[PDB]
Amino acid sequence: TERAYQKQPTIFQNKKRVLLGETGKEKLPRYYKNIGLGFKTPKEAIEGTYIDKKCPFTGNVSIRGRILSGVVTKMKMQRTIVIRRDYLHYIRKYNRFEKRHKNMSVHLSPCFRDVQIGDIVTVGECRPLSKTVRFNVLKVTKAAGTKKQFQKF
């Protein structure tokens, strides 16, 4: 649903269904989209009642350009997270390496549920979504390990 002033994508809602008299189910007429380059659209997009302006599966924001990686470190931000990406930069003179990291922002499509902090993610390039958000969630590699555990409460 919606908890804002209004959200509704592109689809013509008010189709004048009724000609003999029935309710049935109603939420069926939904938008849907592929993203190509060998990434499957999840079924979270299809039985997702949420509406998004910036999703790669739901919205108009197509993915051009690049492919990069990251690890999801902080999720304290609305509909977007902050990845981190270590790498091994090289120094010429010393003939050795040094670790660096550069924190990026990326718009978290909320179709990816249970994306919990610390798991590996893969991103794709888009338009300038915000001041820092130029990236977009493309695939969630790790389910944060334990797909089995039960604990106290």
Binding site: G36, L37, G38, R64
Partner: protein, 257 residues
């Protein structure tokens, strides 16, 4: 800066015009036209350096505008016109007639042809579209917006175009087996046989080729131009089958001479 640049230095000019420094500070910047600044050659280089008709750059302003040197059968009167790959120069009364190819070392080679290549010419399609009122238009990289073309011309194909009608014929299509020639990049001028494409979904295609004697190379479809179907070019061809020899064999080409 502000607006378009409109000069070109002699040092900053492309090397495949063979231009030389101490002649002067500046190089002839071509006009805007069908060929970009790295896929072109002016008339003023073609006539003053290679054929070596005129020695000043103001007489070429006279003989390009004495209405004698034309392109494709219509008169072009610029002194810095962008003549590029696969173009046809006619001279109307005094009969000389030219076809432009690449020299395989990287240069633009002179290649003198007859009236049976005034009748046709090849060109590579850049995009296909549909236009207004449902009809097809098809944009060729020689700046040819030519319509009602054919059904089976894919985007990356080659068209044997007449100059007089302006109407296509004998549309060869991209497929493995053909004879091809590289028009940009690190193996320019080579003529070879199409062997493998890879359709990456990373916004490009990439192409391995063999060649005549089988040897392998690699470049892209945009750079590449198709010249025939199965080891027979539709065009006549200069200095062998368009062959880079070896560095040392090119020396011993000159010794056995």
């Amino acid at each position: 800066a502000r607006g378009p640049k409109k000069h070109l230095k002699r040092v900053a000019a492309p090397k495949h015009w063979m231009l030389d420094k101490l002649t002067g500070v500046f190089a002839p910047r071509p006009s805007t036209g069908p060929h970009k600044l790295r896929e072109c050659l002016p008339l003023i280089v073609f006539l003053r350096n290679r054929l070596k008709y005129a020695l000043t750059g103001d007489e070429v302003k006279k003989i390009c505008m004495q209405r004698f040197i034309k392109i494709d059968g219509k008169v072009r009167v610029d002194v810095t016109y962008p003549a590029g790959f696969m173009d046809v120069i006619s001279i109307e009364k005094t009969g000389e007639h030219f076809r432009l190819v690449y020299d395989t070392k990287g240069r633009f080679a002179v290649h003198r042809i007859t009236v049976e290549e005034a009748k046709y010419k090849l060109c590579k399609v850049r995009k296909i579209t549909v236009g207004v009122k449902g009809i097809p238009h098809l944009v060729t990289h020689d700046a040819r917006t030519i319509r009602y073309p054919d059904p089976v011309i894919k985007v990356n194909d080659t068209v044997q175009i007449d100059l007089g009608t302006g109407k296509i014929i004998n549309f060869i299509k991209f497929d493995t087996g053909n004879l091809c020639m590289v028009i940009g990049g690190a193996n320019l001028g080579r003529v070879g046989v199409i062997t493998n494409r890879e359709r990456h979904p990373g916004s490009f295609d990439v192409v391995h080729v063999k060649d005549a004697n089988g040897n392998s190379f690699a470049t892209r479809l945009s750079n590449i131009f198709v010249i025939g179907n199965g080891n027979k070019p539709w065009i006549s061809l200069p200095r062998g089958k368009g062959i880079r020899l070896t560095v040392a064999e090119e020396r011993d080409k000159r010794l056995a001479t």
